[PDB]
Design a protein around this ligand. Sequence first.
Ligand code: HEM
Ligand code: HEM
Ligand SMILES: O=C(CCCCCn1ccnc1)N[C@@H](Cc1ccccc1)C(=O)O
Ligand SMILES: O=C(CCCCCn1ccnc1)N[C@@H](Cc1ccccc1)C(=O)O
Ligand SMILES: Cc1ccc(O)cc1
Ligand SMILES: Cc1ccc(O)cc1
Ligand SMILES: Cc1ccc(O)cc1
Lengths: 451, 451
Amino acid sequence: KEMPQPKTFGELKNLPLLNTDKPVQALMKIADELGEIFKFEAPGRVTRYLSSQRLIKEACDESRFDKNLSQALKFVRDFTGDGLATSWTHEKNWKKAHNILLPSFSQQAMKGYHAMMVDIAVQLVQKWERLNADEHIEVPEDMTRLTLDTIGLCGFNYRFNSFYRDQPHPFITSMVRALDEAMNKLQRPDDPAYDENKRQFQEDIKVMNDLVDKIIADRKASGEQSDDLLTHMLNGKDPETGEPLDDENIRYQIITFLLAGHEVTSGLLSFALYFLVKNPHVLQKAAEEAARVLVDPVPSYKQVKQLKYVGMVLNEALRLWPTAPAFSLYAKEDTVLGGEYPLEKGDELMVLIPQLHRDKTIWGDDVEEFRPERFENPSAIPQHAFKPFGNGQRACIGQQFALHEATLVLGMMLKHFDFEDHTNYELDIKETLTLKPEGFVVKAKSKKIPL
Amino acid sequence: KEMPQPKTFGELKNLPLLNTDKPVQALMKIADELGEIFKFEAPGRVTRYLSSQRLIKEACDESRFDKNLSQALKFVRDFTGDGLATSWTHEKNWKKAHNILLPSFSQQAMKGYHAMMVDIAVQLVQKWERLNADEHIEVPEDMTRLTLDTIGLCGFNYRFNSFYRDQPHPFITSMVRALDEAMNKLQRPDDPAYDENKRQFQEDIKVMNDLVDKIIADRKASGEQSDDLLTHMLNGKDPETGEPLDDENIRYQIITFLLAGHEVTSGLLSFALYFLVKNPHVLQKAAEEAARVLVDPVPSYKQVKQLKYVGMVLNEALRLWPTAPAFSLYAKEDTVLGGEYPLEKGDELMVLIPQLHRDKTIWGDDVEEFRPERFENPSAIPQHAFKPFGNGQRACIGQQFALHEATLVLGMMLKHFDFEDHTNYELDIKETLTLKPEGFVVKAKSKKIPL
Ligand code: HEM
Ligand code: HEM
Ligand SMILES: O=C(CCCCCn1ccnc1)N[C@@H](Cc1ccccc1)C(=O)O
Ligand SMILES: O=C(CCCCCn1ccnc1)N[C@@H](Cc1ccccc1)C(=O)O
Ligand SMILES: Cc1ccc(O)cc1
Ligand SMILES: Cc1ccc(O)cc1
Ligand SMILES: Cc1ccc(O)cc1
């Protein structure tokens, strides 16, 4: 009945707890101390952090809870607008874009994206093939180069050419800096000091809008039909409204897609590789599978589908460190959560996914151990125990994309290189709105298998 | 390229090889002579027995091979119908029952079964506590009493009261005799000599149907809810189709669960205790773990989960003598196995699990030794090297049930008794469709620890 709540800071309530480099890990530690649910209060903001599958399975009841825009998502909405990830379910653009875009994110659509993913994955492999002896790989950096490029190419037939760059593309510079500002506002009063941050945020928004609007305009002017999200958005009609997305919503979708693919997915790859190199038996098993399945110089889609163990590795990395580590819900009506936490309509819930995923009640005592075999049989996973991609109709639309990309790339990585955690890397999880293993570096020794 | 095949008997091809009381062990011996794959042909039947992890890891690829009903299972289907174990994957009832029953077989459902499992386990312990000096235990017999009672009680809140009986329950008489008939049909086929076997087989099918249908009817008449499989099947709706199991399929599930819970699971316990008394250091280590963990008169669910070594003991017993020793696959499409055995769509494979489990390339030279420590790390076990519970979505739904039951009981056995292999029992594996150490007897000297 009485809900735990972490330490408060007077009028700031719990808000300063989020004034940390790693708010998600701080929230995890709080959930470790306080259990499956705790109230988190900020000035004019109350939410309840859920950590147990028991409570989260209820929160995932879409008849009782709907996606809430967390404060983080509201700030990202300043540049992703009413894009799929930052639109309310009841907003007309959400269902509309959802209906229009769902087919181009299907498992079937991955067949069409596969060749472009391979293109970038090959650049990644070639990059690593081309390292000198005892040069290392900056994993999240290269994974991000890969994932950004992949979504650039698959989504908008645009080549960020991240493997040809140290300095990020002007769109990314703004996106990252807009994200950094969005995150920083969470930790933050809006004293005059932030006028530079505010101007910069608006400049970055204008930058992203301008570049993405140009890409949309450029495509419309060409008429060039490609196998990409932009083409599908320019032509797709929502069966329900019969309408296409307007160009502004397309822009927000593109920004959203770049945001999702640019970091969130690379985090999965980085964590996966981190866990692989920390768990040599797992790596060996994933590498065996990579070697057994990826028998052609270029993986086919079907071969990627056969990378079962690689997929388990990915799920197990998603279990430990889901890179979009939280999502937010609101009670559609007065309701009682877990039979003992009465919620009023509009009350907010935060699903603290890494805690969910450490629910010992679901996963057993060994929750911190990296064991892809937990995912050997996907039906052994209870409902709503494993929610790296969120929940229900507001679940990650890019799930199949992210997983296909990640499986392909990790499969190729495992095919082509032995990996050395030559620094005995100490997991240091950097938090933006997503998670990455900061400074994670490996050496890759080529297995000399040509492409 | 050319696939070995054991000796043939003219028109009967290999069929007479199965006309032996130990066909699995005979198939293992053939696999020892012929290696990882051999064609096994009967009139109008061809299958390929796989014995190497190299090939079985391919066989376990669900995008290439689906569960096949072996001839044994097809004969078992005559009384287990489209129960989960004898339904084809494409059978509406398989997915439906699978979706419906999966939660009642999860690790979380074991928590709710645990008390009834303890109930039977305590009856087992008390039976042994109550033996007179120099009164031995008929191990498989008592394990079967335990396992059958356990599935009767957790499965349908029915007390077979097997520890009160010399004479098996009429359901069991018919089930055992139907099993023996199914197996005999393999070794056999339409000659008049077997017409009494048919009448008996149908009488036994009728008995099982009637008795189980009455259990279903009585439950539906009662309205009473138990924390049991029958209740879940009467009330559960497949999330996918929204449909419940019908009463006939529930009957097939019950019979299947009873068959699974009778002899298959007791075989595990019997083999485990066999190996334990044959490997006294292992027994001592398992016994040390039971004493350290089972600190209460009655094991809790959590304590059974802490019986890690006992779990390994069970896995190692499953490695050597998987009590469901084979499963059958068919090629969903034309495919090449192991890069050198072309298979046409619909070609059948038998996974000879005990031979798989002896793959020295996986387990090392000492494959015959009982070393539960081989199971210390699942990640260290190559993919599909260890398949005592079958594979993929058609894997044993009762796996967690069996293991929890077996761990609980074995832990308690190890807690409560010292065991003497007082006859220096010579392993003699009786084959029905499952394997048991026939005549395996031990003496148990109580450690006099109360319950
Ligand atoms: C491993 C990578 C990813 C993870 C772990 C992940 C996770 C998630 C999560 C947890 C949600 C729900 C967020 C919420 O409820 O507030 C979500 C939604 C979404 N994701 Fe991802 N995501 C990933 C990759 C991607 C990619 C690659 C794309 C597309 C380029 C994408 C696009 C989306 C979109 C558009 C939504 C909003 C869906 C809707 O509400 O209609 N994501 N994602
Ligand atoms: C140590 C004991 C057990 C072992 C070694 C075992 C083994 C297996 C194997 C090897 C399969 C796959 C068979 C095939 O592919 O044709 C299977 C399936 C099955 N088992 Fe078990 N089993 C055991 C105990 C149990 C128990 C206690 C139950 C439930 C009471 C159970 C119920 C089933 C069912 C219903 C299936 C069919 C699953 C499906 O295909 O959807 N088993 N088992
Ligand atoms: O971590 C979060 C949400 C994380 C966003 C995930 C971003 N994503 C979504 C889809 N792919 C990535 N935290 C809370 C923190 C807070 C609580 C109370 C008051 C102020 C802030 C919030 O934003 O509301
Ligand atoms: O051992 C077997 C079947 C395996 C029994 C497993 C029973 N189980 C499964 C899950 N829980 C118990 N062998 C072959 C024998 C055969 C080959 C060719 C022609 C005729 C017969 C078969 O039945 O097809
Ligand atoms: C897809 C894309 C390409 C360029 C750019 O500047 C923005 C978005
Ligand atoms: C960082 C981030 C934020 C939102 C989103 O949908 C993806 C990534
Ligand atoms: C499953 C069952 C239970 C009782 C009985 O009499 C027959 C069958």
